[model samples]
Target chain A: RKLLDVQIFKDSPVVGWSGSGMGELETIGDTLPVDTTVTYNGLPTLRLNVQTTVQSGWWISLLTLRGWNTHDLSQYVENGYLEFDIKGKEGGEDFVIGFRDKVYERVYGLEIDVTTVISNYVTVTTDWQHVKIPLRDLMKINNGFDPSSVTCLVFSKRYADPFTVWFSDIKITSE
Target chain B: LLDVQIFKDSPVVGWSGSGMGELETIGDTLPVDTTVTYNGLPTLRLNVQTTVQSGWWISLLTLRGWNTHDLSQYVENGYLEFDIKGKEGGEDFVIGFRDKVYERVYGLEIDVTTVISNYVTVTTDWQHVKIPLRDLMKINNGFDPSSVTCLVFSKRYADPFTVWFSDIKITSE
Candidate 1:
């Protein structure tokens, strides 16, 4: 059609989503309170809380932080289309999608690891799919990934099975 | 027991953001304490802190719990009262009611799906709850007491607890 939005999180998490209290204390994982139950393309959609439910085992890695500031996003990397619109709370979720490349004094940046042509599989249900990642296939295979200061979009999860997920319209589209 | 007041004394439930219109609250989650009182004046000083790092803080209590009130004549002999205390005690959390599904985002309206509630205990004196608007619409049904809106309080617990609420009514014994 004709699209060129480029938003990072539409309704409510850019509406500034947060939480990177590292993980492992109470078994890590948190960010629970965005409700309109099953929303997609509207009305507050951003709830990510999961559980492998083995109490306190450790090996945490439950990150989530989208509100970048040093964001240059390198002019959307030409073909631009790192879109988002996921849905789960009832799907085979196994997190860890990546993006990071911003380091002034370096706290940990330059990353890449995401694959899924157009997305919608792993038999994820609850419906509301559409994930188009292609800032030119992200570094092609990674070694020096840097989509022009692509701040951060690291929704991770070390080894939590699946408990919930509901995000919506995080954008950066073109082509 | 035949009360109806929504909150006693002045409300500063402000974050200056849809506390709807200056019920006031800088949002440290309900901060308004006239030096802690029981049957006294203002009291709603919950400075949640378990080293702090959790989510869900629903704070929305208006002039009768935010902008919409009909409660259908107190939902048939209501029974939701308050007067808790905790600053050393336990401090559990959750107290709700919302039913104006006509939504909004820049302010009022996040439809709690009519999930009525009552789960706040742990006190050091001043404890007096009653919760029973037909058992909170009988364990969560489509709450539409003519479209009541607002009135909620939710917070997670892991350590920090300093609850202190008082006089939020709807009694009818």
Candidate 2:
């Protein structure tokens, strides 16, 4: 089953880091600014402009769809994975993709470091890179990975650094 | 909005478990059977013989459709209501609901063992039980009632007992 299919700014332009038909795009600190300026695969993409001035204090940014509603994706845990398209203006950026559930009030998620998963650590710069991550590779938080009810998908940084990345076609599929 | 409508002339499709599937056990021996029958109305009957002297013997009953149904919308004003009947006077049993949090996070089971003995005098007659969702909130720190996955009924005692359940439904206030 296709659990989530988030196209970047398809219905409307980005308003203060939030999409129109999709949900809110949020940031933890003032390290980076997010907007909808880049286009990938004929759709406007989420543009993350990471600045070097305040790199260490900033953690990560996220785009939560449907106002953080609990989405049941447990059937996909065994045979499916999450897929997305990413492009880096500059190479060698380290970040992690995460999945969250409604287990706690405080935000915690099962994260997989991009540098460790990909062969070159997301170094593709010439064209858009397609990334597929198996659900089993996602590390569990609080000793449970209840894909039966997932809350959100997050993208965070491994370190404080100045880089630019564009994201599009965030989805979950059986393939 | 109500997310689920159960036991109201609905087709039984997603119920699966050993209490209803198998008779294998490691503890004391007892006959257990479950079926959908009409008793004054359409209902689910869980008939069990608890003649064992062991500390724990359990037959799991679960609703598979609930795995994907989100119950959070009705958390504030919802109640899990059901009708139950016992074969003998002063029979005791336990019923619990579980959610997907912290690895099979447990929910507080309604211990009808004492409630049946103290409140009601008749064992053959059916009694209505209503449990508020908030009562289950005390079980876990991050109890997401919205993601409830399973409903279980178990008996762990040194005596013999039997129980029946009907009209298992969740309603909003």
Candidate 3:
């Protein structure tokens, strides 16, 4: 099942749906300010600029279709996985691709840390790399997963330093 | 398909997933007041008080506590109806049922104008109100009526006002 497949951006904007940058610094401590911009490709790509302080622990940057394109992925849970492309300003930075739900309570979603799934931490350099994350490998929290109400896919990181990255072409595919 | 029922009146004060009121005001002042009370019968009561500034009004009465219930299955077969008795006879408002499919993507909002010119007189007596799903207008992309998330009452009046409502429900007829 092809749960989600879309070219998020295009050189010429069409009358269709596209994901937008929606991110937040989940931590309250002293952290570096984050900047986000869109780069023009055949489609628009998301660019993130971050400078983490020692207090910078965890943060999230999400390109979502929730309020833009709500999808019912309840049918693709067992065989679903997410694929996306990323280009890092440098290499060896750890990040994860995750999913969230509309459940009022926390612990109902999953977050798969890329470093834990891939060997050598799968560094992101100036070159674009394809990352495929199996849905099963994503760590489930309190209530397991409710595939039907899958809301948003998130790209997150936990670092205490400065870094920049670009992300594009996110898809949710299933066997 | 069975229409989801949200009974406003019950002895078990909190079981109905009611009484949680969320309010929004545009270009207004402080203290947009909302209250809920039980009249010792089978009816729940809602009271609203606010000051509407120029180019500003209050809108959207949403029941956030009903997140677990999905009202999409009944959207095709029925209409969302309710009962209300406002404080005045000529008050106007709109009823909208909101659904959520994704965080950034908003669900379809089906609205029917309940202004005095279109509907009944908003006297101090209860009256039945109905909004057919077919008559509802779509305001967003990816509107899955089967995954409805909440119900809201919105108005764009530019005057200070108060309103009351009771016996809110959804049924297929």
Candidate 4:
């Protein structure tokens, strides 16, 4: 028997309690979770506008847990995948996605949560495409990023032309 | 329980920058902080910082005066053991050991077999790190178990973090 799939979002947002366009440099984007222009299975999707055109190197949106707290996603690290359905307004809209954990990073007297970025992976196309990110991939040489205490799901764009991407059925599944 | 303890509540010998573009160490970063102990046994407090440092930072917990102690006698039935904990969870570092040359004063590069990565992970909670002597003696850069010099800690993470240590010994099984 297969294990139950943990759902984060589908027709509407769930699991995550908060989200916003925030990152290192000033970015331009509109996030519409219920955007109707794109439809997969007659349902709206999480739409993201990315503009990597401002001497602004990076931009990101965070899906945080309740009270912006960290969640234990360790159990799914083995034989598990971060499954999602995605598409682009135009073909070849590539952005990065990953998790942010509580493992602290002290940079010049300020501590910030660490991000595990899947820098090179699948890119989005205009047609609906299913994407599955192996949870094990996030454990990059155990550089102290903890899956057991995942605070947020991070979607980031770093140095790319302006584009829009749609996301649907974001969930975690175990094989 | 074996106790060939390295720290008898005294200061160790060396700590220097082993990373590229790293900052020089500050005052007493690694102190034999007797105030905090395990069963009244003093522990070594590691409070190294690497803020704005380009690469990783490291420390050498060597014997006083860089003295090389022969440990071959204990290799038959011994394991390197220590009680370790971090100030916060997930302060990751690579723990290794250097081998001193026989009848020489210079030290060799770190031995991979002595790295604690194969044994334990550092967290806020105390963990008894025990590694077999055999593991520290294999394909080890021509390492001489007889002249094991220093316990090396290379922080894999660029960020600054603190870890406390005590009861470090080459214990018997």
Which of the numbered candidates is closest to the native, going by highest lDDT? Answer: 4
lDDT of 2 by residue, B18-105 (tens): 3332323211112122343435565554444435444544433323333334677766776767776766656665555555654543
Clashes of 4: 0
Q: Which stretches of candidate 3 lie over 4 Å from their true place?
A: A1-41, A68-71, A104-121, A139-143, B1-173
lDDT of 3 by residue, B96-126 (tens): 5555555543423433334433556676666
Q: Give the Cα error of residue B9 in candidate 3, in Å.
A: 39
Error of 2 at A151 (Å): 1.1
Task: State each candidate's clash count.
Answer: 12, 2, 15, 0
The 10-residue segment of model 3 chain B with minimum total lDDT is B11-20
Give per-residue CA lDDT, model 2, range A1-175, as digits (tens): 3354433223121211111111122331211233434666676565655545342344444444322445676666666667777787776566556665565543454422221234333565745888876765663343565666565566555555556676666667663
- The interface RMSD for candidate 4 is 24.9
True contacts kept of each: 0.00, 0.00, 0.00, 0.00
**What interface-residue Cα RMSD does candidate 1 give after superposition?**
13.3
Q: Please report, as a residue range, the 10-residue window in candidate 2 chain A with the lowest summed lDDT.
A: A14-23
**DockQ: which is higher, 1 or 3?**
3
Best of the candidates, TM-score:
4
Candidate 2 stretches with Cα past 4 Å from truth are: A1-37, A104-121, A139-142, B1-173
lDDT of 1 by residue, B1-173 (tens): 34666666544222222222222244222556766766658786655543434444456554322335566666666776777777676556556666565553443443332222234446576777777676565444455666665566655443455667788877764
Task: Using lDDT as the measure, name the better of candidate 2 and candidate 4.
Answer: 4
Query: What lDDT score is found at residue B113 in candidate 3?
Result: 37
Candidate 1 Cα errors over 4 Å, as ranges: A1-175, B1-74, B81-83, B86-126, B131-145, B152-162, B165-173
